[PDB]
């Protein structure tokens, strides 16, 4: 068949039952934000502050959150967050290149032979398509977070949830400990692009869509990868169209197309509207509805940060930054999947990643023998044809250089801690994660001697339509504790540290266990923000408090993923001045991969962060 995985119970199955992502109440969310600002304020900064949090909180702020809990009763069926949050990425007029579209690179094949471009690059869009089809027909397993997965996970409890109503089935799971998750961001990961507009751009999905967009050396191609039925093409032919395109020789156009998806929102809102007033509408329909965007580049990767670089941001030419993703193969088929953050959080990505990974190097669809099918490649693959003005070809060059500017200055390097990792600190009775968010602080206060606001991504996606709340991992405890580890080191004694860092590890997850509940902060003063401004309100005096601006200017920005799918992956820092930490703690190692501009040093902090976690498994060894 054409799917797989095989699900008893509907992908969408637990949709309709799915709690509302609670607003917390409003005492707790100032206490919690002015906990944040403790270790990062100076003494008259914090005073200042609190006044502030207290006149908001009975004066304008009780008043937001009055109508905020008002307007959320009267849309049950969505998140109070949802939104406003789309919002935040789509209004946004900046490049989406670096400052939001992240990577993830595929692990190779075991099998040495599978790892050839043209075989690797078919079985992924085989393995894609196959998911798509899969998420269609109903039958990939809903997402969900088990406490007790022998108890949960098994045919026995599937056979039977199956037959509870969607508007009652999340009570079934519940009573077992296990966690459905939000599904719906999933209707956006194929067939689906983000559309420059003015102010809010916008979100185009087109279900009708058969065809497969592939990227080479600048030249736009399409082809059909589900037939006329809606059945999978025959491997074997689509096999062939992609050796027909890795062929061809004309080389980089002088106006390659795909400089305009890094531009300026509003620059590229109207190149692309002049794009159709000068007649390409047809063609960049064609280009939207693509179920995703294949990119073979023509070079191999010399090392970690070639690898990085090129699935980050890659040269300009050969990815179209809009699309929902991008699926990059490369010519010693290193692959990866670059994407478009407006519509997704990447649970989504993840699980996606995790299939198609799966099923690419179990299930091949292909053999590194197989001869293509005889068929007529020059008739099946359309070659996409643009008509360019001269405005038009003055803003493609303009989008070249703007884009190689910016990437000059970016700056990737990678760690691999090799001294253990998950299995030795879960023995010492610590979070695996603190220990990681503590080596980072500890770090940046050994390397510039500061304490920065610090940013930790954490998923609300157990609630209807949740996103992501944040982490805030720069607490009194890690301030104190990284002080003791590197001003005076002497001044205390082993147990003595060890004490500290379960203050840390303990006082993290607490965190860790609030956000995933809805019960931090950050979102919570945003949607306050959001609501004063759009019923058309001057900004509240808390916001403009240079403090607040200070708290949501992250100088670390960090987030980590565990799979055996993934070797690496990354995103630009976010601020100018920043790190963009992405890391994994495995079981015998702990891995990052970090991200800086020219205001700061990578290499450097990495070699403190090496430092910083020697000292910590030391201390834990009682040395
Ligand atoms: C060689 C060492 C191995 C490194 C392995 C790192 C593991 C992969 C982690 C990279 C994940 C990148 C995509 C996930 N995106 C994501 O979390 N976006 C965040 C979304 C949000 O927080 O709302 C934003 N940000 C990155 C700024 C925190």
């Given at each position: 068949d054409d799917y797989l995985q095989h699900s008893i119970?509907?992908?969408?199955?637990?949709q309709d039952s799915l709690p509302r992502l609670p607003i917390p109440k409003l005492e707790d969310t100032m206490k919690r934000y002015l906990n944040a600002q403790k270790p990062l304020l100076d003494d008259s900064q914090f005073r200042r502050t609190e006044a502030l949090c207290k006149n908001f909180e009975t004066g304008v702020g009780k008043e937001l959150h009055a109508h905020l809990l008002a307007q959320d009763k009267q849309n049950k069926?969505?998140?109070?967050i949802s939104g406003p949050w789309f919002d935040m990425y789509l209004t946004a007029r900046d490049s989406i290149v670096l400052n939001f579209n992240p990577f993830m690179a595929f692990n190779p094949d075991p099998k040495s032979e599978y790892n050839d471009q043209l075989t690797r690059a078919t079985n992924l869009t085989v393995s894609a398509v196959r998911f798509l089809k899969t998420l269609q027909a109903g039958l990939l397993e809903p997402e969900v977070f088990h406490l007790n997965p022998s108890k949960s996970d098994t045919d026995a409890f599937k056979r039977l949830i199956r037959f509870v109503p969607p508007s009652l089935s999340w009570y079934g799971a519940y009573l077992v400990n296990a966690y459905p998750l939000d599904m719906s961001q999933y209707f956006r990961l194929f067939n689906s692009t983000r559309i420059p507009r003015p102010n809010r751009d916008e979100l185009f999905t087109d279900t009708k869509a058969r065809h497969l967009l592939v990227l080479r050396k600048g030249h736009f191609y399409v082809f059909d990868v589900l037939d006329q039925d809606g059945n999978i093409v025959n491997p074997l032919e689509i096999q062939a169209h992609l050796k027909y395109i890795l062929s061809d020789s004309s080389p980089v156009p002088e106006f390659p197309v795909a400089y305009l998806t890094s531009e300026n929102r509003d620059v590229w809102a109207e190149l692309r509207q002049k794009l159709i007033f000068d007649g390409n509408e047809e063609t960049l329909k064609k280009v939207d509805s693509a179920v995703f965007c294949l990119c073979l580049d023509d070079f191999p990767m010399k090392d970690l940060i070639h690898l990085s670089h090129t699935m980050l941001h890659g040269d300009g030419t050969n990815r179209w930054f809009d699309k929902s993703f991008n699926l990059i193969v490369a010519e010693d088929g290193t692959a990866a999947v670059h994407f478009e953050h407006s519509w997704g959080d990447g649970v989504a990505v993840l699980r996606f990643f995790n299939e198609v990974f799966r099923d690419s190097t179990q299930?091949?669809?292909?053999?590194?023998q197989s001869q293509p099918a005889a068929t007529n490649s020059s008739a099946s693959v359309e070659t996409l044809s643009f008509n360019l003005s001269g405005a038009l070809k003055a803003g493609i060059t303009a989008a070249k250089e703007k884009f190689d500017t910016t990437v000059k200055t970016l700056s990737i390097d990678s760690i691999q801690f090799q001294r253990g990792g998950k299995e030795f600190l879960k023995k010492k009775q610590l979070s695996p994660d603190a220990v990681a968010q503590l080596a980072f602080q500890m770090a940046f206060l050994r390397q510039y001697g500061q304490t920065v606001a610090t940013y930790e991504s954490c998923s609300t996606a157990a609630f209807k339509h949740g996103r992501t709340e944040t982490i805030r991992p720069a607490s009194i405890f890690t301030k104190r504790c990284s002080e003791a580890f590197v001003?005076?080191?002497?001044?205390?004694?082993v147990g003595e540290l060890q004490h500290m860092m379960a203050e840390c590890s303990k006082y993290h997850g607490q965190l860790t266990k609030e956000a995933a509940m809805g019960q931090g902060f950050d979102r919570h003063l945003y949607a306050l923000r959001y609501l004063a401004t759009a019923r058309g309100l001057?900004?509240?005096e808390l916001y403009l408090d240079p403090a607040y601006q200070q708290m949501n200017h992250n100088i670390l920005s960090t987030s980590t993923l565990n799979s055996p799918a993934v070797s690496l992956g990354g995103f630009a820092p976010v601020v100018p001045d920043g790190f963009g930490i992405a890391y994994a703690v495995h079981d015998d190692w702990i891995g990052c991969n970090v991200s800086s501009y020219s205001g700061r040093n990578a290499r450097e902090f990495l070699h403190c962060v090496q430092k910083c976690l020697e000292d910590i498994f030391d201390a834990l060894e009682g040395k």
């Open positions: 119970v509907p992908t969408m199955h637990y069926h969505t998140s109070y299930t091949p669809a292909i053999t590194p001003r005076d080191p002497s001044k205390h004694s001057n900004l509240p």
